[PDB]
Design a protein around this nucleic acid. Sequence first.
RNA 1: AAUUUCUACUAAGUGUAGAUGGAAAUUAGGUGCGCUUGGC
DNA 2: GCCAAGCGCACCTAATTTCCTGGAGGACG
DNA 3: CGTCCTCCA
Length: 1213
Amino acid sequence: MSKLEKFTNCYSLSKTLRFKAIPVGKTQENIDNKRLLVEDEKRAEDYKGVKKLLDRYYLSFINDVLHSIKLKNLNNYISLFRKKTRTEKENKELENLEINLRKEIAKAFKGNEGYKSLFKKDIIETILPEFLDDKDEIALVNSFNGFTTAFTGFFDNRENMFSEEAKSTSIAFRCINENLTRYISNMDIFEKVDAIFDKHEVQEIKEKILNSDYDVEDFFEGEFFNFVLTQEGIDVYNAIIGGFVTESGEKIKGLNEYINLYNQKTKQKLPKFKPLYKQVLSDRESLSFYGEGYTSDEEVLEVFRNTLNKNSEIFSSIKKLEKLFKNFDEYSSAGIFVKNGPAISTISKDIFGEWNVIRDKWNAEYDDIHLVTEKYEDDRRKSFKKIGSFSLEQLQEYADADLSVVEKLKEIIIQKVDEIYKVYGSSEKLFDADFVLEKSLKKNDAVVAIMKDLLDSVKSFENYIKAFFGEGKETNRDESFYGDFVLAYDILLKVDHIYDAIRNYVTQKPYSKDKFKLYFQNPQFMGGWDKDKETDYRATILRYGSKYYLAIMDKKYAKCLQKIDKDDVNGNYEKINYKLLPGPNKMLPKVFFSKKWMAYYNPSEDIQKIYKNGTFKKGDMFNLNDCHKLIDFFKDSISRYPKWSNAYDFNFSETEKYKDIAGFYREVEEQGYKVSFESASKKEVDKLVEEGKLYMFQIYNKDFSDKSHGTPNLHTMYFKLLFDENNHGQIRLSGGAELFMRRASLKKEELVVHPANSPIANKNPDNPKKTTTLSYDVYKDKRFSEDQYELHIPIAINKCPKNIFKINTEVRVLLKHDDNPYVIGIDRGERNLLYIVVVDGKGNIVEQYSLNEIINNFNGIRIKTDYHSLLDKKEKERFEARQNWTSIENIKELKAGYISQVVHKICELVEKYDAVIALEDLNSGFKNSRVKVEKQVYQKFEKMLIDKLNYMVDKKSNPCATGGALKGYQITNKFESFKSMSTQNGFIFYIPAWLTSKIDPSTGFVNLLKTKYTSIADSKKFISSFDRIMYVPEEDLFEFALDYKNFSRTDADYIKKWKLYSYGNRIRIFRDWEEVCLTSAYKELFNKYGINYQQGDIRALLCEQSDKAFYSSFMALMSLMLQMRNSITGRTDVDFLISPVKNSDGIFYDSRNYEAQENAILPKNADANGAYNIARKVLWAIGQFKKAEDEKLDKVKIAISNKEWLEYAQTSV
RNA sequence: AAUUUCUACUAAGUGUAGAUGGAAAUUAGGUGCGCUUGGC
DNA sequence: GCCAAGCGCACCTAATTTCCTGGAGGACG
DNA sequence: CGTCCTCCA
Ligand SMILES: [Mg+2]
Ligand code: NA
């Protein structure tokens, strides 16, 4: 036996199969003539409208409750929440006060008498109309009378808002778990940071943000939190923190701005506040002003031409500012000023090449006067900070003999004006009055590039100009320059709103129609599949051979398939006969205590008293003997209930054996499902479609083509298995199917075509058949060029699981008693997206390779796909698009594509080796800081892996075999959320990543030294703590003998005593890279300071140095020597791992000696080393399971400590 | 360069290989650019 | 040239809820 | 009463 096969039929899950629906015969014309698709497209728009009118009600309902709430538990919860020493029982009381706070919110909604009617037809029929005023809005709502069933799901989505549970879509959850937690964390930050705010700034927030009705401090007391339950108060509170922008553009500072300024001014690091999340269903309007944008291509072109032609004022303002600078000499250089700050940085760079040069020259002249250095540089920085402005004459001081500042400036303005003209010559045709654009602006990259290139050059000019404004408050200021310069600068600034607004419009995605749902004039269309509901749902399934069909009865002919009999002679369709008894624990009481049934069969008061009282259910009023007499009442009513009695061949148990009522309900549930097919005359059914009484679509994907001949999609197997006699409820067909129309979005004529009989280039370089020639055209994206029906079919897998155990526990047990358990270790990364190492129970490397490339072999042909390269390209295409205002392509499909191959390889690995999976326990705070690197695959990899392992099927297996489609493996727990995961998800273990990569696999050696240069005396103490430092002539290496117990915070190490050598090279990273030969660099350093490095033990000699640079360069070299991992950024060709320690045979581990070998015993590179040691850290956890009794396996801690890891790693060898 | 959809193909000629939980709702994040005030 | 706090706009990505129902019951001609 | 939409849990 294997460990996998114990994991079938563990839990239920639902999935959706999707198909094209192809109209058969006259159905399309009959659908055309009745205009069914037009009705459905309009209904979808109106449906979204009504959904908006309903929210306007729900929101008003929400805000009236929330505005009137005073939380009772509040002050007790805030008290206990801020306690810093909580006993376990206090933690429990905290959770109880959190629960009670949410129940307080849920009851304030649900205690309303009319609460229930907010989710039945009353809200559409009555409530929402009386609440509305617009005649047209009211008529829109009324148009769904008799159709409110179409809102059942939407009512569930709205119900969710009022749950008391800690669930993400709940108002209560948003208020208490999320916003109250931030509010309380902000109270602490207020008490720390309070003093930094002066009286003026607190008053400004009070006057402009608090309407002068509150003090800023009030929103940091516990009692004020009720103010913040509605979007209104959230807005005010986030404005205290972040400020706002006035109608005139002034940015009023919030508290976080003042904290940042203070930090930046004092070089401190005080914490900032967090803003509160939004109120559920709020219609948010910002408190900051932002001007009106543009709404059409024509408007944009008119604005662009009115405001930017040669004769426009903005152009003229440039021709003034040019002619002005071009005549600098008529104005006194002592009177034109560059404000100190960014303006001097800009001007420093344009004239001296670097931003800091003017500050540098200033510092040099300061030193000339004033010459401890910690205050000096700071006192001098302060004195330089006290300067507000710098004249042009003053700057000429800093010019050098050949340089003249004024002359250099006017070159720069000509350089930027010539750049502006340059772009105008390319913008000639765009200014023509006769110009009209063929392509829409949001699809016309050529026109937008002309517009953006022009706008950019004008912006570039504007930022240069702005540095010449100075502080402005200068007494010396030359108003014969300023006066006109300010008139022209103020009109130029008008290009700011234009630039923003043009980018805001031009970058919008163009409108794309969504598919829409088809109802066939039925508010419960295709609701389910039960025979006794065919007439209400008016949709069934048919089979003719291998082909399947959806059959829809017209609103006027619901019974037309009830009549049809076998055509004994000619051919016949098979019509499905589907019966389902869902949720017997609810349906059985409802059916057999109905007024319809209690007439026929009267209860005993015995029978009646139980269900009224409830002595049938396990709980506090439980009484076993009553369930038995009730199970039989039900069992005796099933006999007399014909539509159930003859639909399911029941075979119950001896009643005396049921332990509770649920033991009965489970047998009804499993047996309440049956699917068969009866004959129907194909002549009559066809004529029904002909006469328009029946609509017929073939349920299609490519595996049903007459030309299909390969392995079908897993989903095609699922679908056919729905109706296979060997499927005994492993996969049930579910209700809630849906049919949609997706209008074509490409024109056939506009499609890339490969014409018949002209050879097509094959793209796979390992494919020896270089060309393919077909006799028919082949079109790119062909499927989007015609309207398409799609059918979405829900299915349910393992609805009645028989293998109920805690999945994690079972894995630990199985690992304990497994003589040689294999591990697949997986290192997550971005140099290598994924890297795989498989080990055996003894830690031997069995397989190792990167997954940057997917190698697939089929039909003798090999194919390699460098997905790391493909994602890299996509990531760069998107960066460029963002900066260029061009189309931002998706990356997530490509990620999914890549990840699917990865997951397929991993599943094969799991099956081949019966192996469990080892991953880094990456906290979610690490995984978000790498989302900026859009190669990022960490979390999507996890989701798709965990999903597949919820029901893992070998498509090639026999469907009835273990691991086949009817008996999939479930070796991860049912995916509910990341929120709720532990460090073990069945076969997946998450272990501490610490020192899995930066460790010498052949010795266990790690770098536990702190080698940042801090001071001369610390460097002397560091050098002196080695047992010996000497040059080794016979090896041309420097040896550094250390005992780790002589060094700070090295306790984790186990071996303690090491001899380090200057062996090989290293890649130093700095801002770029350089290669360093360690021995040669040590010789350079010692020679630079006259050091006789041949004098045996040399550390006393080294401590005789007085130069700080020696000790600093020496610590740097030590760091490079202890830097075992070495790579070049964005590079395949360098990622080697090299150790400064010898192994027992006196050789240095160097991954590059193993990267060569096809079958390496040790890791081939640093990423392999990481995956390898992640796997071993799980091998250790398996060692812990072996140390423990089975009763206690659930409590074995799996996170190896850092000290246990170094001992483990250093005694493996 | 074809697809229920996606990725990679052409795979022997209207397709091949692997993956594929939909629908609705709510909410959050990341990138990029502009503006405000600031820090090397 | 780099970066911080905050406001805005455009885009794409993604976490976590819910349902995956037939038969009684009502409203209506 | 026969039909169609709503409601239950
Ligand atoms: Mg196939
Ligand atoms: Na942003």
